[PDB]
């Protein structure tokens, strides 16, 4: 029972519309929600697949993935997911899984930010548990080298460098905390110097936003060109050594980037090339070990398993 974009065309043909309206509304008060939602889907899929396991709250039986190093004080937008979930439950009771809801929400967030528009495959079901340890082991970190980034993607089933380069384009919008670049700014890999792959002019700007012994929670735009617009500007930045986190710049500057450099350039040269690759990579990531058929359930409240 493979995933299909028409899964809810009869049971809830208005699901995508409900999701979109919820995001449109939220964007007025929080213009960062779109980026935040896309990241939630990414963090869901990289841990036991896209099964909404990340949406589960703490229980006496299992710890929440929300306390993972990659999610704690970082992941956000959970209340917004509850809102669209409630709205969908009203329109179509016990029909749309949280896993599918989050996938649609990620796609709509990308489109609303100016990105490509497409119908994501559907039919995923919700996990019966959360996987904190697995999240700590599977979620990639900003300090990862290119070989480590590739290993992290391959680990969850994405072997193509195209998947890695295209999906990294998610950093074409959204925010990043000073904490994750302090090493690149003042002491990279215990060298006592800033990361040489970071543009010196941009280095000065970032140091001003993130001074030593400063607020590590302060936010910086992932894309200095178009902070809230989903476009290929992220790759243009890499070509100028303006990737924000180490994992971004590595795609273009790593000694192991022989295969990723041409992809970065290709995406920087054509928005069409990037958008096509992003959709293709997004659908592949959304196809990671999904629960289908009668496996798992259709969670009524994304924060807890049905009882
Ligand atoms: C290649 C490995 C990746 C690493 C190491 C990574 C790392 C990070 C880090 C450190 C942040 C900042 C979190 C914070 O400041 O609290 C972030 C933000 C973000 N990431 Fe990535 N990321 C990766 C891949 C992806 C992918 C595959 C997507 C989705 C297609 C994605 C989408 C986002 C978005 C949209 C934001 C902004 C979230 C917000 O503003 O709330 N990332 N990422
Ligand atoms: C049944 O509830 C809803 C339906 C829609 C439909 C939108 C459309 O058809 O474009 C939007 C929001 C709702 O809460
Ligand atoms: Ca998951
Ligand atoms: Ca952008
Ligand atoms: Na696959």
From Swiss-Prot:
Gene3D superfamilies for this protein: 1.10.520.10, Peroxidase, domain 2 (1.10.420.10)
InterPro entries, per database record: Haem_peroxidase (IPR002016), Haem_peroxidase_sf (IPR010255), Peroxidase_pln (IPR000823), Peroxidases_AS (IPR019794), Peroxidases_heam-ligand_BS (IPR019793), Secretory_peroxidase (IPR033905)
GO molecular function, one term: lactoperoxidase activity
Residues flagged as site, Transition state stabilizer: 39
Localization per Swiss-Prot or TrEMBL: Secreted; Vacuole
Gene Ontology terms describing biological process: hydrogen peroxide catabolic process; response to oxidative stress
List of residues binding substrate: 140
Subunit-level organization: Monomer.
Name assigned to this protein: Peroxidase C1A
Source species of the chain: Armoracia rusticana (Horseradish)
Classification lineage: Eukaryota, Viridiplantae, Streptophyta, Embryophyta, Tracheophyta
